[PDB]
Amino acid sequence: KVFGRCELAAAMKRHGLDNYRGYSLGNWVCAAKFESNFNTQATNRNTDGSTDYGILQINSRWWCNDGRTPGSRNLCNIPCSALLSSDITASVNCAKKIVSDGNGMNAWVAWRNRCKGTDVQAWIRGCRL
Template sequence: MARRIVIIIYTLAIFFNAFGIYGKVYTRCGLVKELLNMDFSRSFIGNWVCLIESESGKNTSSIKYKANRSQGLGIFQIRSKDWCTFHRKGGICNVRCEDMLDENITDDATCAQKFGFRAWDGWKRNCKGRKLPLPLC
């Protein structure tokens, strides 16, 4: 049984390395600093952090399969159906969906800012109407 688990883990590691998918799970403070460095408005950082925590758990390689056969990808859960295209640049954000799953969240953030945090159901469910100040770091 232990050998089987090792083989599965090894296979997954090869798979992720082959496709260049390297994720990162941010701390709350690390995420705040990263968003501020990308010129997110300081007054809305609490909303963006709440959205990210509710959508992906701050994990850049998060994939969630949706009922409409699309996927939510990356730290912002960019929708593969409309916002990006697999294997080539495309969609509303003109990005490759695979690029939403790596550690570099610059392209993810650029795409997310086109829509604003109000476009996400996770924000509406978990953040809307709450006092969301800038997290203390």
Template sequence: MKTFYELLIVLSITSSLVDSKMYLSCELAKEFAKNDMERHLIPHWICLVQAESQGNTSKMVEMPNLTANYGIFQINSKDWCGKDKKGGNCNIKCSDLLNDDIKDDIKCAKEVFNRNGLNGWKGVCLIEAESGGDSSKVTEFPNLSTSYGIFQINSKEWCRKGRRGGECGARCEDFLTEDIKLDIKCAKVIYDRHGFKHWKGWLNRCKQRPLPDVSKCSYSTYS
């Protein structure tokens, strides 16, 4: 017979499995199109997410400077979201970037992009290199910050642990579910502020290199 604590562990694991998701390229293309990403930039966004979080919406990476990156865009808690409450330039809780709804991730990522371009990200070809499409990816850094979800949104600037905050006004943990709408929302914020240059993953794996081929993703897949 399972003990109470064993049941809690099972329930916790089950909840995590339900809320996080690994996004594939065509799935990302569809979500990005739904959330008004400019179509000619969608391959760049997919590359960015692959580099930052490998598509893992639950990815969280702690940074040496005590901030963290959250979700598929790895939005940082320093400027973009709040760890325990809504905050940051995106006015979201960092944890909100960790669920499977990536609308807010996209919005915040756009904000980051607009300020910093693709240089605002620190991954490896954006979603593939960052999270491999895994919406539950969490990466902790020595500076105590963490990157979350498929975009590996960092808690230093973009979200806050346990509460909404940061530049995306998001709770970092919310970037870890399979709904990546919040991730997309925050990624939009990042993009709007910094462009793709915010993500080092894009710089290292995507800039002036072949981008993911989404030509096989039919128009209906986008819409």
């Protein structure tokens, strides 16, 4: 599913991301824009044999089971296939674990490169939730 900006903002808010561990909703929407272009089906294979899945491009080496990442830990206790649903519940829950893992939102490279240091409030401008 490809979300609209404010559609995703609303769904992330309903799943408790606004200000989760101090990261405003605009940070989460920004990260999804540049990780996946708001596409729940986004994927990317890495050179280490891991794959990034879903709207927040979460990596299979640590966070989910795809069957075929060597040393796969599955720390979010989900099939990687769950991060590809139109339902963002699995991606949100796993993102909460990732952002609490000791690097904050720096765990998302597109967030570091395109959101960090900016007025990320602009990502919820006009949503008036």
